[PDB]
PDB file of all heavy atoms in Angstrom:
ATOM      1  N   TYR Z  61      14.210 -22.672  28.096  1.00 43.97           N
ATOM      2  CA  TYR Z  61      13.345 -22.006  27.125  1.00 43.97           C
ATOM      3  C   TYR Z  61      11.965 -22.671  27.024  1.00 43.97           C
ATOM      4  O   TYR Z  61      11.639 -23.340  26.043  1.00 43.97           O
ATOM      5  CB  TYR Z  61      14.007 -21.945  25.746  1.00 43.97           C
ATOM      6  CG  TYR Z  61      14.960 -20.805  25.614  1.00 43.97           C
ATOM      7  CD1 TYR Z  61      15.969 -20.816  24.662  1.00 43.97           C
ATOM      8  CD2 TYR Z  61      14.880 -19.723  26.467  1.00 43.97           C
ATOM      9  CE1 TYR Z  61      16.851 -19.765  24.542  1.00 43.97           C
ATOM     10  CE2 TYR Z  61      15.744 -18.667  26.355  1.00 43.97           C
ATOM     11  CZ  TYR Z  61      16.736 -18.693  25.404  1.00 43.97           C
ATOM     12  OH  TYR Z  61      17.600 -17.639  25.303  1.00 43.97           O
ATOM     13  N   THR Z  62      11.209 -22.511  28.106  1.00 45.57           N
ATOM     14  CA  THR Z  62       9.836 -22.975  28.106  1.00 45.57           C
ATOM     15  C   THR Z  62       9.127 -22.543  26.821  1.00 45.57           C
ATOM     16  O   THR Z  62       9.233 -21.388  26.396  1.00 45.57           O
ATOM     17  CB  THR Z  62       9.093 -22.468  29.351  1.00 45.57           C
ATOM     18  OG1 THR Z  62       7.721 -22.875  29.301  1.00 45.57           O
ATOM     19  CG2 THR Z  62       9.177 -20.966  29.469  1.00 45.57           C
ATOM     20  N   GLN Z  63       8.456 -23.508  26.186  1.00 45.14           N
ATOM     21  CA  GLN Z  63       8.088 -23.380  24.784  1.00 45.14           C
ATOM     22  C   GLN Z  63       7.379 -22.070  24.499  1.00 45.14           C
ATOM     23  O   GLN Z  63       7.749 -21.346  23.555  1.00 45.14           O
ATOM     24  CB  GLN Z  63       7.191 -24.547  24.376  1.00 45.14           C
ATOM     25  CG  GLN Z  63       6.809 -24.569  22.937  1.00 45.14           C
ATOM     26  CD  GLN Z  63       5.950 -25.774  22.593  1.00 45.14           C
ATOM     27  OE1 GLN Z  63       5.581 -26.534  23.469  1.00 45.14           O
ATOM     28  NE2 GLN Z  63       5.655 -25.956  21.319  1.00 45.14           N
ATOM     29  N   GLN Z  64       6.361 -21.748  25.298  1.00 43.97           N
ATOM     30  CA  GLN Z  64       5.662 -20.492  25.085  1.00 43.97           C
ATOM     31  C   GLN Z  64       6.609 -19.305  25.150  1.00 43.97           C
ATOM     32  O   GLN Z  64       6.429 -18.338  24.439  1.00 43.97           O
ATOM     33  CB  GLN Z  64       4.556 -20.337  26.137  1.00 43.97           C
ATOM     34  CG  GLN Z  64       5.048 -20.552  27.526  1.00 43.97           C
ATOM     35  CD  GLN Z  64       3.927 -20.717  28.529  1.00 43.97           C
ATOM     36  OE1 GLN Z  64       2.761 -20.775  28.151  1.00 43.97           O
ATOM     37  NE2 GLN Z  64       4.278 -20.793  29.794  1.00 43.97           N
ATOM     38  N   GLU Z  65       7.627 -19.385  26.018  1.00 42.79           N
ATOM     39  CA  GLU Z  65       8.581 -18.293  26.090  1.00 42.79           C
ATOM     40  C   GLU Z  65       9.370 -18.151  24.793  1.00 42.79           C
ATOM     41  O   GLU Z  65       9.634 -17.033  24.335  1.00 42.79           O
ATOM     42  CB  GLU Z  65       9.528 -18.475  27.269  1.00 42.79           C
ATOM     43  CG  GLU Z  65      10.279 -17.228  27.684  1.00 42.79           C
ATOM     44  CD  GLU Z  65      11.335 -16.838  26.699  1.00 42.79           C
ATOM     45  OE1 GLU Z  65      12.013 -17.742  26.166  1.00 42.79           O
ATOM     46  OE2 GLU Z  65      11.494 -15.623  26.429  1.00 42.79           O
ATOM     47  N   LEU Z  66       9.803 -19.270  24.229  1.00 39.91           N
ATOM     48  CA  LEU Z  66      10.499 -19.175  22.960  1.00 39.91           C
ATOM     49  C   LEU Z  66       9.585 -18.579  21.909  1.00 39.91           C
ATOM     50  O   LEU Z  66      10.003 -17.687  21.138  1.00 39.91           O
ATOM     51  CB  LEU Z  66      10.983 -20.551  22.515  1.00 39.91           C
ATOM     52  CG  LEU Z  66      11.773 -20.479  21.217  1.00 39.91           C
ATOM     53  CD1 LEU Z  66      12.878 -19.451  21.330  1.00 39.91           C
ATOM     54  CD2 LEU Z  66      12.343 -21.839  20.872  1.00 39.91           C
ATOM     55  N   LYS Z  67       8.338 -19.037  21.853  1.00 41.38           N
ATOM     56  CA  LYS Z  67       7.347 -18.416  20.988  1.00 41.38           C
ATOM     57  C   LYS Z  67       7.284 -16.920  21.220  1.00 41.38           C
ATOM     58  O   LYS Z  67       7.255 -16.133  20.261  1.00 41.38           O
ATOM     59  CB  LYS Z  67       5.986 -19.046  21.242  1.00 41.38           C
ATOM     60  CG  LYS Z  67       5.079 -19.145  20.056  1.00 41.38           C
ATOM     61  CD  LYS Z  67       3.966 -20.138  20.324  1.00 41.38           C
ATOM     62  CE  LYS Z  67       2.932 -20.134  19.206  1.00 41.38           C
ATOM     63  NZ  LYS Z  67       3.418 -20.911  18.036  1.00 41.38           N
ATOM     64  N   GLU Z  68       7.292 -16.515  22.484  1.00 40.85           N
ATOM     65  CA  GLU Z  68       7.216 -15.119  22.848  1.00 40.85           C
ATOM     66  C   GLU Z  68       8.392 -14.315  22.280  1.00 40.85           C
ATOM     67  O   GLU Z  68       8.205 -13.242  21.706  1.00 40.85           O
ATOM     68  CB  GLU Z  68       7.188 -15.025  24.378  1.00 40.85           C
ATOM     69  CG  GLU Z  68       6.889 -13.681  24.965  1.00 40.85           C
ATOM     70  CD  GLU Z  68       8.122 -12.813  25.067  1.00 40.85           C
ATOM     71  OE1 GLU Z  68       9.233 -13.352  25.162  1.00 40.85           O
ATOM     72  OE2 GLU Z  68       7.944 -11.570  25.068  1.00 40.85           O
ATOM     73  N   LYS Z  69       9.591 -14.850  22.449  1.00 39.96           N
ATOM     74  CA  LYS Z  69      10.774 -14.194  21.930  1.00 39.96           C
ATOM     75  C   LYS Z  69      10.671 -14.035  20.430  1.00 39.96           C
ATOM     76  O   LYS Z  69      10.940 -12.945  19.879  1.00 39.96           O
ATOM     77  CB  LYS Z  69      12.015 -14.995  22.281  1.00 39.96           C
ATOM     78  CG  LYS Z  69      12.686 -14.558  23.560  1.00 39.96           C
ATOM     79  CD  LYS Z  69      14.042 -15.232  23.693  1.00 39.96           C
ATOM     80  CE  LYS Z  69      14.867 -15.003  22.435  1.00 39.96           C
ATOM     81  NZ  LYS Z  69      16.174 -15.722  22.478  1.00 39.96           N
ATOM     82  N   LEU Z  70      10.278 -15.104  19.745  1.00 37.92           N
ATOM     83  CA  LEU Z  70      10.122 -15.038  18.310  1.00 37.92           C
ATOM     84  C   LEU Z  70       9.124 -13.964  17.923  1.00 37.92           C
ATOM     85  O   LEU Z  70       9.369 -13.184  16.985  1.00 37.92           O
ATOM     86  CB  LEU Z  70       9.637 -16.396  17.774  1.00 37.92           C
ATOM     87  CG  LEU Z  70      10.561 -17.556  18.125  1.00 37.92           C
ATOM     88  CD1 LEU Z  70      10.187 -18.773  17.298  1.00 37.92           C
ATOM     89  CD2 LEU Z  70      12.016 -17.169  17.898  1.00 37.92           C
TER      90      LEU Z  70
END
Side-chain angles (χ1 to χ4, degrees):
Chain Z
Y61 278 159
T62 177
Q63 183 178 5
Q64 51 194 5
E65 197 288 321
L66 183 53
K67 212 163 174 78
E68 190 276 333
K69 267 191 53 184
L70 303 193

